[PDB]
Amino acid sequence: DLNVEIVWSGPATFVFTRTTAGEIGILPRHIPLVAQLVDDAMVRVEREGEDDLRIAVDGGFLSVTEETVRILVFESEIDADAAKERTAAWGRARLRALGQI
Amino acid sequence: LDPNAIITAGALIGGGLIMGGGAIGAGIGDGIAGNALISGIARQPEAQGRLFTPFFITVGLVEAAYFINLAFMALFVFATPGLQ
Amino acid sequence: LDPNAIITAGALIGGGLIMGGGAIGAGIGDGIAGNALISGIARQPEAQGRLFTPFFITVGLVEAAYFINLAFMALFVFATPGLQ
Amino acid sequence: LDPNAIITAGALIGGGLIMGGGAIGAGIGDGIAGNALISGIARQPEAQGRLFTPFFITVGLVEAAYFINLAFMALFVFATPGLQ
Amino acid sequence: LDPNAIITAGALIGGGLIMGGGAIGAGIGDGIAGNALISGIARQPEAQGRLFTPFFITVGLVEAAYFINLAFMALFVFATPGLQ
Amino acid sequence: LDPNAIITAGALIGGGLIMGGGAIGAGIGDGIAGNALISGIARQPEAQGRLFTPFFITVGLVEAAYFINLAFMALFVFATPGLQ
Amino acid sequence: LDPNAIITAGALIGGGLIMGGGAIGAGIGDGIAGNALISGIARQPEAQGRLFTPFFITVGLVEAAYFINLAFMALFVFATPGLQ
Amino acid sequence: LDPNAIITAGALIGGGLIMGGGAIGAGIGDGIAGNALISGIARQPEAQGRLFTPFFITVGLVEAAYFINLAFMALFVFATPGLQ
Amino acid sequence: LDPNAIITAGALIGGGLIMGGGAIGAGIGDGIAGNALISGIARQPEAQGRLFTPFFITVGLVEAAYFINLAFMALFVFATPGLQ
Amino acid sequence: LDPNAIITAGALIGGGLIMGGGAIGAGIGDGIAGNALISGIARQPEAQGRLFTPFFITVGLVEAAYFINLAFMALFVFATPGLQ
Amino acid sequence: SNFLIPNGTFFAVLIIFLIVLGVISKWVVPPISKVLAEREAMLAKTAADNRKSAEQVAAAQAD
Amino acid sequence: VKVRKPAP
Amino acid sequence: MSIFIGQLIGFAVIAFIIVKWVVPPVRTLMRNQQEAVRAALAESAEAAKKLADADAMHAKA
Amino acid sequence: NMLTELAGASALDHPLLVEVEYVGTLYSFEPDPETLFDALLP
Amino acid sequence: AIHVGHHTLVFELFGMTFNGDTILATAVTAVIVIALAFYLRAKVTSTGVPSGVQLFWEALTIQMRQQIEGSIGMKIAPFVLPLSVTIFVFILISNWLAVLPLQYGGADGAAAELYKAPASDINFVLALALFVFVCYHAAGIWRRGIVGHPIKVVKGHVAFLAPINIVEELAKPISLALRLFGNIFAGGILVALIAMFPWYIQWFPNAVWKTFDLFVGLIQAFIFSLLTILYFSQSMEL
């Protein structure tokens, strides 16, 4: 497992997101990395036998270290009705997080 | 010795060269274009539909040469120029 | 000597060239496409599924050349055109 | 052996080499240029309109090198130089 | 000039060409796929396992062609088409 | 056997080799340079104006190598050295 | 002309082609795999231990093909099929 | 027949091979070096002055080989070793 | 016509093919390995020493084949198999 | 027919093959190494001198093969092994 | 003789293919499309029923 | 802006 | 007949490989899909029952 | 921290940047480090 | 003795030759496909647990519908789905029926196959490829009109490359056929070549090649289906 820290924090098994270069998935021993999340980036965290956390992010920055994955920015606290330039990006972020896409 | 035999052997060798060169070119070019397409899809899932339009354009050109070669190869082995 | 012997030797050499070119093209194109696929999977493992579709679109577009060559190669060696 | 037959066989082999080389060059160069175009469109979806200009220039060179060869092959095969 | 001698010489040359092309294609394709595999394992060591799924598929599509050439080279040098 | 026939066949084969190699080099080099140009323009559109300077140099160093060979093929085919 | 002489010349040419193709494939594939390994080690000094397992596999697949060619080349030049 | 005919045909074929290899190498190497130069200038416009010195070191090497080949080809075709 | 003359011509052509393929493979593989080494040293100043470990392996694999081929070329050209 | 003529033609073809392969390898390997050098200097201007240490090594190795081929080509064309 | 030359078999094979296509068009794909559409509609109805139960269990207490 | 490199 | 015997042995090997390493995984996928659709059907039935119960409770209240 | 790592790898020519301080396995930057530095320094 | 070609059961009719072996193989494949289809028609259930045959058929339909949706709207081209699925199943069954042990010795030392994959015959591949060719060209005629369609295919995505475009349009059918042909034709030879080994050595290479040929046939059916769908999409746009 790898310690994910959204700045939520805790162990996880997989971390999916979408940077400027493209979609990236991080596993426990990924190489050190520094990337910029896309404007409407969505971060999915898969834990050992728990529901995946689908966080919406604005102006994020991913940093993978030998120990932890730190995201420098949830679907439960998002309303679809209000979710439907940067304003468009944030709306798209909520849409992606919810699952409407 | 039959002149037609020599001409036909030369035509067969030339057609083989044409088709082998076309094969190399088509295979490597298509592999390269497909590598580009696969990377683009892996990095931008929604980009797939947008990527086919340029991709196949490339393939078109890459295919053209090959089949053009094929055509000439036929002319070498089925209607051999200079054959008596 | 026998015209058919010369023609058959030429046909064998031409078919060898055809198959050599086809093998080079197929091997290198398949390697490049597999490189794209493997890099895409390593970058983001869960994309594997959606990558297998374009990959086989690439592989086919490559393999065609090779196998097309193969067909013609058979035509060279098994039913030699212009074999007196 | 009729000298014309030897000259024609040599011309056919030479033209086959010409077209094989042209096919290899055209296929691989077009594949590489198309890889560049596809990657650019993948990273910059709005860049398509501006990319087609340089891309074709590349093709305009590659294809040229191919078609020039296609011309000379014809000269080799249809009007064979030195054909006594 | 026993015709079978010319047939066998041409068949040996064709088989040599077939193996040359097959070896080039197999070696380069395997090297490229291995480059992708090594880069992926370096980037994501924990994805190693599943990364073998595409790699072998690529190695399946490359080596196959090689051995296919093998099957056709043996033919050329053991059951020569058109042999007299 | 007319010596001029053998010499002309050899000259045609040599010229075919010359132009095949020239076409391979020109096509692949132009493709690679165009790939660099296309990627550079895609990354930053404003770079276009300044990018055509090195590009034309690269193509200049590629096409030249082609055209020289082309000229030499003429020597081989039209005024064959040592034609006897 | 001794049939064995022509057959042996063809066998030597075929074995030369076999080694040429094997050499090209082995050298280029090993170079590419080593490029991947060197890049991986440069990025991670401690990844070396885990990077030899895939690298060797790649070197296992490439070299094997080359060595297979070697065997057949011996067969071509030491127990020539079709010799008499 | 005249031995000079066979020797001259062989020399022409060898010179054609030399030019084919030289052109392939020169074109592809110049393309690769120019790709590096174009990418470097695109990323760092100010680097245009600094990048030329390595580039000319690369091209200078590449062209060297090509021109050396040319010299030897001039030896093969105009003053054929072993001519008689 | 002396049979040994034909056998020696075939052996010379085969050895030339052996050395040409070996040279292509060695040159391109060393170029690729050196590209990796130069990039790695550029990215990390202190990495130089350690990087020479995998590098020497890659070159060791690339040169081995080459030199092995060289050996066999000698066998072709100095102790010709099947030569009477 | 003079056997020395056949041997000389074979030696000329073999030497042409050797030089063609050597030139291809040298050109492409030097291009790749120079691409690495130019890229490294573009990223790290401070490394303008450092990178020349590995670079030469790489070039050395590449050039080595080339010149070795050249040497053997001389032995092929000037002191042909097998004249009789 | 050449195996690459077409034959009358080209017609015969075509005919067979055609009838197979007909079957697949008239007894495979329409039923399968209907089944898939019904399954998707059932999933949508399940979601709607869950939401309606959730809102009724609240409204009843409210009213 | 801290930089973890020696001064030039 | 000899080549027939060899080919039959080869086919036996093929069938052994298929049953050993191909049948189990595909059977597992078939079971997974069957159980997923069965669970969907059960979910729909229990959701209909839940809506009926909610309607009954609302009418009572 | 991330800014320090990007500054080390990236050329120090950002207009906003021009202060700078110097003190005595690498980090991979998914795009070029220059773009990340430009987008992060603000 | 390898006996390339040499179709058996050949018969004449209406002044045309017919390769009886390929007709029989195609008929067997069609019978298998129709039997599967009818076995489905008697087991389709939208309310119960689907049978394995229903799972297979619906997996094929879902994959092909997904491909169409990605390329061109289903409402735009509903007819493409049945064509793609039938092509896929036909080619897959034809290729996979060769795994069965129908190869024997013809008493001359040359192997003879009781069942040979029909795609190893130029007529079969030509039939499929030309039918698909006419189908998507007629679909393009309907979509863009009788006059517009040829104009658009000649112009292509970029008008000034009209010559190449023409070649491309001729390359689509041929590449569709020959590719498949080769893929199967190669097998039809390799097994025959493997027949020259003694049984105690023949068993192993034959097993390896047939196991790989299973994947080859699956991949070839998949590629043919996707390429047909994509050509339909290219021919039906704007």
Numbering used by the authors:
A (entry chain H): 3 to 9, 16 to 81, 86 to 96, 104 to 120
B (entry chain M), C (entry chain L), D (entry chain N), E (entry chain T), F (entry chain O), G (entry chain S), ...: 3 to 86
K (entry chain b): 22 to 84
L (entry chain C): 538 to 545
M (entry chain d): 1 to 61
N (entry chain G): 52 to 69, 207 to 212, 220 to 237
O (entry chain a): 10 to 247
Sentences from the study reporting this entry:
Protons cross the membrane via two half-channels at the interface between the rotating ring and the relatively static stator component of the ATP synthase, and they provide the energy from the pmf required to generate the turning of the rotor. In the mycobacterial enzyme, this inverted L-shaped half-channel is clearly present, but the water molecules that form the Grotthuss chain were not resolved. The mycobacterial inlet channel in the a-subunit contains the polar residues aHis12, aHis15, aHis16, aAsp30, aAsn104, aGln112, aAsp117, aGlu122, aLys125, aGln192, aLys219, aAsp222, and aGln229, which are probably involved in the coordination of the water molecules that form the Grotthuss chain. The proton inlet pathway then passes through a small aperture between α-helices aH5 and aH6 formed by residues aGly196 and aAsp222 into the interface between the a-subunit and the c-ring. As in the bovine and other ATP synthases, the outlet channel is more open and funnel-shaped. In S2 (where there are no resolved substates) the c-ring has traveled two c-monomers further round (ca.120°), and in state 3 substates S3a to S3c have all traveled on to approximately the same position, four c-monomers (or ca. 280°) further on. Similar to the prior study, the electron density maps for each of states S1 to S3 has density for both tethered and untethered forms, and hence those particle classes contain enzymes that are auto-inhibited and others that are not inhibited by this mechanism. In the tethered forms the mycobacterial-specific extensions of the α-subunit make contact with the γ-subunit. In the first element described before, residues 520 to 548 extend from the C-terminal region of α-subunits and provide a “hook” which catches into a “loop” provided by residues 212 to 220 in the lower globular domain of the γ-subunit, thereby tethering the stator and rotor together and inhibiting rotation.
